[PDB]
């Protein structure tokens, strides 16, 4: 998270870190949507250009983390990986969505609690240019560094609040083909403010709070960016609501 702040404890109890087993390292963000299911981006799991295709033995997820925070964080193995069948990494990450099933259901706590997924009304009410959502993750505090990556890495979970940007403005900001499965968010140059997702935040959630029911909803998954926090550029995010039918399919399949 570029230009964000230390999150308060318990701010984002649905926050999940995806972790490689050996070597131990942060791979991506993710979110908790039930006691048993975790949402992330496809590209966190499958990405041919980097020769990346993880199996369940390669990965752990970590939940309830603020900074090993024992008696507060839960580490879980994965039972199964599900990647959207029409995930198009060849072009520019159309349908960048994946579900991970936890080996075993976890207990909820002050620090562990699922986010809501949007429905039709939620999307219609909340997705308007200028409405601000919120991005959280453990990724780089800056796109580049002088000496070492270590220098831009946060000690605690970062948060930033960023506004949805108009589709035409999103399309005008880049030459990449934008689809209906994506949206962009961020401040225009010469707005008063800055901020963006950056390396190690991808797969993490873009949430919005409903005024109507006081509940948090994941409208987005951090998907892609040209740089982090560059002027005239915007973060792009998987449109979760538009892909909800696939989410339902996977979860409602018998013996999933």
């Amino acid at each position: 998270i570029v230009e964000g702040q230390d999150a308060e404890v318990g701010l984002s109890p649905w926050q999940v870190m995806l972790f490689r087993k050996s070597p131990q390292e942060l791979l991506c963000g993710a979110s908790l949507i039930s006691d048993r299911w975790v949402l992330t981006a496809a590209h966190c799991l499958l990405y041919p250009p980097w020769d990346k295709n993880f199996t369940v033995d390669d990965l752990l997820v970590r939940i309830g983390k603020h900074s090993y925070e024992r008696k507060v964080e839960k580490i879980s193995m994965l039972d199964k990986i599900y990647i959207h069948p029409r995930y198009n990494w060849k072009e520019n990450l159309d349908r960048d969505i994946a579900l991970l099933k936890l080996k075993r259901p976890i207990e909820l706590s002050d620090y562990i609690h699922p986010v809501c997924l949007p429905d039709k009304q939620t999307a219609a009410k909340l997705l308007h240019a200028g409405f601000k959502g919120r991005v959280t993750g453990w990724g780089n505090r800056r796109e580049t560094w002088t000496t070492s990556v270590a220098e831009v890495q946060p000690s605690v979970l970062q948060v930033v609040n960023l506004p949805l940007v108009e589709r035409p403005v999103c399309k005008a900001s880049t030459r990449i083909r934008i689809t209906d499965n994506m949206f962009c968010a961020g401040y225009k140059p010469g707005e008063g403010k800055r901020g963006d997702a950056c390396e190690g935040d991808s797969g993490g959630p873009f949430v919005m709070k409903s005024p109507y029911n006081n509940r948090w909803y994941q409208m987005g998954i951090v998907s892609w960016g040209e740089g982090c926090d560059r002027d005239g550029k915007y973060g792009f995010y998987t449109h979760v609501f538009r892909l909800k039918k696939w989410i339902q399919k996977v979860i409602d399949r018998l013996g999933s």
Partner: protein, 64 residues
């Protein structure tokens, strides 16, 4: 994924011309000093993934 600046000629899936990704099917000719970079048709090598955050405390051996 974040597309960052190409660091050697021949790379793709990185920022080549200004803040624009140079995509698959293309490769990035790095300008020397005073030269612009050029994204051209050709086979490119993806800019490698940067060394991830591997700085955490060790977790129980049970989780292997």
């Amino acid at each position: 994924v974040v597309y960052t600046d190409x660091t050697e000629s021949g790379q793709n899936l990185x920022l080549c011309e200004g803040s624009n990704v140079c995509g698959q099917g293309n490769k990035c000719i790095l300008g020397s000093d005073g030269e612009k970079n050029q994204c051209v048709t050709g086979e490119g090598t993806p800019k490698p993934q940067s060394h991830n955050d591997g700085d955490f405390e060790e977790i129980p051996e049970e989780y292997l």
